[PDB]
Amino acid sequence: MASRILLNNGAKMPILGLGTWKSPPGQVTEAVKVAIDVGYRHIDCAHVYQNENEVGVAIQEKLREQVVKREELFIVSKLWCTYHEKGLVKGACQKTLSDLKLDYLDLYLIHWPTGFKPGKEFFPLDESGNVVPSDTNILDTWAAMEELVDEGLVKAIGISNFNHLQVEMILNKPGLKYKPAVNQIECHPYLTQEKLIQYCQSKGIVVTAYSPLGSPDRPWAKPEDPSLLEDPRIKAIAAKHNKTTAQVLIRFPMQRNLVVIPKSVTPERIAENFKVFDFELSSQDMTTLLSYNRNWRVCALLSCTSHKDYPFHEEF
Numbered sequence: 601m602a603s604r605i606l607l608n609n610g611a612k613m614p615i616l617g618l619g620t621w622k623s624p625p626g627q628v629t630e631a632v633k634v635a636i637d638v639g640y641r642h643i644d645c646a647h648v649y650q651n652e653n654e655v656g657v658a659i660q661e662k663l664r665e666q667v668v669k670r671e672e673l674f675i676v677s678k679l680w681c682t683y684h685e686k687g688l689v690k691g692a693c694q695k696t697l698s699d700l701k702l703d704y705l706d707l708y709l710i711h712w713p714t715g716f717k718p719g720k721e722f723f724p725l726d727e728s729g730n731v732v733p734s735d736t737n738i739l740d741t742w743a744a745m746e747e748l749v750d751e752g753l754v755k756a757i758g759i760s761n762f763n764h765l766q767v768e769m770i771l772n773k774p775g776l777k778y779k780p781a782v783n784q785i786e787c788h789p790y791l792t793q794e795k796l797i798q799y800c801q802s803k804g805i806v807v808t809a810y811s812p813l814g815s816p817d818r819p820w821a822k823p824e825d826p827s828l829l830e831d832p833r834i835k836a837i838a839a840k841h842n843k844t845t846a847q848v849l850i851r852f853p854m855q856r857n858l859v860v861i862p863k864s865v866t867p868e869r870i871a872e873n874f875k876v877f878d879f880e881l882s883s884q885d886m887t888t889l890l891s892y893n894r895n896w897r898v899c900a901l902l903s904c905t906s907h908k909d910y911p912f913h914e915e916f
């Protein structure tokens with residue numbers, strides 16, 4: 601298992617990264633410092649996570665300390681939904697660069713295919729509670745992303761939460777200049793995503809699996825919800841390999857040629873989650889894990905089901 605995967609822009613992306621959604625601003629600086637100290641070279645960020653400044657403090661300290669060189673890091677962020685307007689894309693990227701204290705991103709993603717009305721609110725609502733959409737065509741947003749490559753702000757561009765028809769729309773864009781390098785999507789044994797993954801891979805688009813542990817800290821979690829980390833079948837596979845359930849859950853997407861971005865702010869877990877390059881799940885193990893699919897989606901964007909570009913009505 602090589603540590604990096606080749607992207608269609610010619611750059612190599614570390615297959616393991618640190619997630620930062622929900623990482624409290626008072627804990628994420630140390631989390632990122634620890635991650636870099638124990639070998640992580642890829643950090644997954646977003647403006648909407650409200651902690652890019654604090655992530656940036658950690659990156660900057662580790663660069664200053666010469667623990668790692670900038671070229672060895674792979675920093676990813678994402679364009680929020682309220683910045684899909686073509687004229688707002690560059691400023692959104694620049695704000696993220698300023699907070700992260702970087703002069704380029706390795707990868708910048710359209711966070712969701714749904715554009716919202718611009719403004720200070722991340723989820724602008726009408727008086728009846730519906731999200732207020734943007735009229736900006738995703739193809740125009742893509743053209744604005746391509747400009748960021750040409751102006752040196754980002755090395756690669758990609759998409760997130762795009763269904764196969766939405767990916768296809770980008771791939772079929774008249775005058776397409778740069779293909780998406782990555783589609784970042786939810787993926788774990790309860791939402792195995794075989795159809796979308798095969799589609800993306802067949803087009804040379806690398807898939808990043810998010811919420812690989814089932815996002816047990818998602819704010820809308822219910823006590824009775826399924827729990828990957830507590831699934832006795834997955835526990836048994838872990839025990840067979842003398843690994844933790846989390847380690848199996850992280851190794852699983854790696855062996856499907858995916859990138860994976862588990863989140864933790866706990867130093868012991870950040871280290872545990874990185875120790876996944878010393879064992880191999882069997883083909884049987886892999887198929888068995890795939891068999892647990894229930895089409896259970898922890899990030900379903902229920903707030904936006906009425907939006908014309910809501911991605912999850914389609915089968916895949």
Ligand SMILES: NC(=O)c1ccc[n+]([C@@H]2O[C@H](COP(=O)([O-])OP(=O)(O)OC[C@H]3O[C@@H](n4cnc5c(N)ncnc54)[C@H](OP(=O)(O)O)[C@@H]3O)[C@@H](O)[C@H]2O)c1
Nearest residue numbers: 619620621810811812813814815817846862863864865866
């Ligand atoms: N593009 C998108 O729309 C999108 C959506 C969702 C997520 N993401 C990205 O994907 C990242 C990962 O997804 P996620 O944050 O939703 O959830 P996740 O990585 O599946 O799970 C995070 C949870 O698991 C716990 N955890 C981590 N390692 C553990 C271990 N070894 N043992 C036991 N528990 C462990 C963490 O606790 P502690 O932190 O307390 O240690 C936290 O509560 C996000 O942070 C974000 O960067 C992107």
Ligand SMILES: O=C(O)Cn1c2ccccc2c2n[nH]c(=S)nc21
Nearest residue numbers: 621646648649711898899900901902
């Ligand atoms: O977009 C993300 O990366 C995670 N995330 C969020 C991150 C920050 C703020 C809101 C959200 C959110 N709301 N719904 C869903 S399904 N996922 C959400």
Ligand SMILES: O=C(O)Cn1c2ccccc2c2n[nH]c(=S)nc21
Nearest residue numbers: 819820897898899900901902903904
């Ligand atoms: O609607 C969203 O954008 C996120 N979200 C929520 C946001 C606020 C309150 C509840 C939820 C919720 N419940 N289930 C799921 S899959 N997603 C949820």
